[PDB]
């Protein structure tokens, strides 16, 4: 009975591959071979945020493009005022091993999580005036890797137990559970309309999930190694995915296949974070080779290089309104580029 | 320069936060962080329980704080986690050392421990941190050797001919076969260790049991040695 199931599975896979080939009438490179190529963009570190003790593992931008949240491996969640280089809050963490952090769109709450398998939500602005532990979520059987707020009451989290979850802050239970990945869900990215979200795991595949219905809409398999960087395109009809094989891929939800590939002979190290600009023209990827790169999402050639960041770069992020880009590495430094 | 009242308040709050961060920096840099790793039969839980003399169902990680000679050490045991370790192991890049506990008594599984130790030793993000080996359950290994089965030769052909090294210091009243087997296991680990450690990290070996109370002192001595070697390397003296 298992043999016929395997035969039907491989037949369906072949049918999907044939459909993708049929829908692949032309490549993205050929269409964009006539557009004006982007020039050489040079970034300068306009601001430094030296205040951490251990490696910075993740960071997130606020909706005001002024306040950002940074998570350090020593057990600190620091709110940085980007303009004035001022520290707004410094939240100690019960578990020093933190791998992700999120900033709520309203700016009232902040998310944290890591090897403790518990997502901690802290209220930034209370009546007392101190940032306390508002809520703790303990349902995952694996280490948390990426969390993103949807509103003040719901949050989507991913853990290493091949499971994504949707949590209601007040109740503290899992509203929806997504179990389609094979191993070590690494990153997630919410769509602009918040209806769906994309997720990348270590099984060299990406999956699109619906927040409300709760099932995998589409699955994309185009990488060769572990996926550790994913981000949603501003248009909402595409996204980018970065792997340890020194390669980024551009996937589209309407084509169900990779649009283009960003790679080079010189680069052989992995990619930890990926982000888009306001227009989506520039794709920023943090390679773990003491540097960062900026490509263009239309012809796949080098456009800019960011340097001066000691140790592997861990977190990358452009402001929601496109002001600047913040990069955090394992050297306990945050650098702002404009 | 001219600043607003709100800007002055923000600067004062930032100064207070910086003062708190400076206060916490001394605490952070005065504590040594260790990563405890081992198999299910390695007996690391017994080691933690013995060394504790100094939550939820999915806690994900357990921390134990022990103080030796007024020096604090935070050892982190990994639990309620999947068998995949290629990703979260990168989190322990700045730890003082990795305490790898291997049960040498039980055979037909020492190859798995050797492979795991080799993967840890050759890890790109673990090429600087040192490894402290705990050959746990030595009494069980001695009893198994004295049982007469002599199954060590079957699993490892290299044990067919192996002379005890001259640097060996067997305990009094110990069978030479037990010493030979124990040092053969130690040399099997050391052969893997001495292949990519170009003066960066070492493989301090220790023969341990589930009842030994000197494990904390051994860990403290190994950490002191690691710190001294790092300081000497910073001065180009070694």
């Amino acid at each position, epitope marked *: 009975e298992l043999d016929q199931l395997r035969q039907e599975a491989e037949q369906l896979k072949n049918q999907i591959r044939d459909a993708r080939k049929a829908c692949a009438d032309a490549t993205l490179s050929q269409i964009t071979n006539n557009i004006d190529p982007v020039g050489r963009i040079q970034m300068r570190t306009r601001r430094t945020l030296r205040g951490h003790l251990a490696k910075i593992y993740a960071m997130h931008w606020g909706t005001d493009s002024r306040l950002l949240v940074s998570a350090s491996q020593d057990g600190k969640l620091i709110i940085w005022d980007s303009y004035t280089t001022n520290k707004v809050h410094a939240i100690p963490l019960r578990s020093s091993w933190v791998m992700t952090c999120a900033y709520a769109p309203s700016g009232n709450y902040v998310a944290c999580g890591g090897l403790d398998n518990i997502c901690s939500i802290y209220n930034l602005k209370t009546r007392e005036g101190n940032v306390r532990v508002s809520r703790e979520l303990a349902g995952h059987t694996g280490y948390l890797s990426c969390c993103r707020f949807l509103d003040d009451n719901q949050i989507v989290t991913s853990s290493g137990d091949t499971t994504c979850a949707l949590w209601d802050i007040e109740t503290g239970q899992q509203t929806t559970t997504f179990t389609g990945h094979t191993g070590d869900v690494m990153s997630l990215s919410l769509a602009p309309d918040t209806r769906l979200f994309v997720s990348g795991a270590c099984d060299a595949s990406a999956k699109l999930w619906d927040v409300r219905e709760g099932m995998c809409r589409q699955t994309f398999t185009g990488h060769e190694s572990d996926i550790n960087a994913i981000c949603f395109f501003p248009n909402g009809n595409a996204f980018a995915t970065g792997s340890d094989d020194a390669t980024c891929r551009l996937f589209d939800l309407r084509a169900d296949q990779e649009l283009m590939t960003y790679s080079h002979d010189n680069i052989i190290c992995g990619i930890t974070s990926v982000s888009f600009s306001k227009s989506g023209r520039l794709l920023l990827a943090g390679y773990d080779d003491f540097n960062c790169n900026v490509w263009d999402a239309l012809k796949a050639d080098r456009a800019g290089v960011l340097a001066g960041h000691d140790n592997r770069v861990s977190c990358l992020g452009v402001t929601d309104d496109g002001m600047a880009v913040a990069t955090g590495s394992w050297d306990s430094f945050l650098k702002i580029w404009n | 320069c001219t600043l607003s009242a709100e800007d002055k308040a923000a600067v004062e709050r930032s100064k207070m936060i910086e003062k708190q961060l400076q206060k916490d920096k001394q605490v952070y840099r005065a504590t040594h962080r260790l990563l405890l790793l081992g198999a299910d039969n390695s007996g690391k839980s017994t080691i933690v329980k013995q060394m504790r003399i100094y939550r939820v169902k999915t806690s994900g990680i357990f921390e134990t704080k022990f103080q030796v000679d007024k020096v604090n050490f935070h050892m982190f045991d990994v639990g309620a986690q999947r068998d*995949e370790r290629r990703k979260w192991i990168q989190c322990f890049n700045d730890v003082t050392a990795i305490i790898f506990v291997v049960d040498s008594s039980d055979y037909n599984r020492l190859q798995e421990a050797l492979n795991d130790f080799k993967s840890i030793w050759n890890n790109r993000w673990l090429r600087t941190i040192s490894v402290i080996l705990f050959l746990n359950k030595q009494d069980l290994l001695a009893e198994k050797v004295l049982a007469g089965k002599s199954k060590i030769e079957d699993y490892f052909p290299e044990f067919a001919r192996y002379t005890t090294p001259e640097d060996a210091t067997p305990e009094p009243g110990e069978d030479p076969r037990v010493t030979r087997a124990k040092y053969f296991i130690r040399d099997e680990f050391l052969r893997i260790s001495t292949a990519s450690g170009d003066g960066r990290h070492y493989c301090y070996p220790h023969f341990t049991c589930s009842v030994d109370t000197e494990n904390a002192r051994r860990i403290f001595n190994d950490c002191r040695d690691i710190i001294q070697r790092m300081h000497l390397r910073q001065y180009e003296l070694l």
Partner: nanobody
Amino acid sequence: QVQLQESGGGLVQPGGSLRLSCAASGFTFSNYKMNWVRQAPGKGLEWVSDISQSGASISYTGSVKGRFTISRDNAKNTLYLQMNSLKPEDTAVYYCARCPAPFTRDCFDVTSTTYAYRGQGTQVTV
């Protein structure tokens, strides 16, 4: 997509010889270190042998050292395992596992229960 297909199983009398071939598709074969995993009935995954990207560094477990040989064909993207003088204790399922990351000597999770970059395996009975 990662494809790893094994071929060469079947019943063999004790002391026989076998040729196990692993075909890899979906990635650059030369950039990844390869190794074999063994799963005996009523037992867990066991590592047998490993070979690096170029084949210069090769190693085997003690139980099979001197009896099994491994080789690579980067031109055809194939991994070959020659078994000589088989034993009744070798009746098991053999899998070809690929290192998660390229241009790296070490690689974890080779013998994982649910490892992704591992083939379906072939049954060898002695």
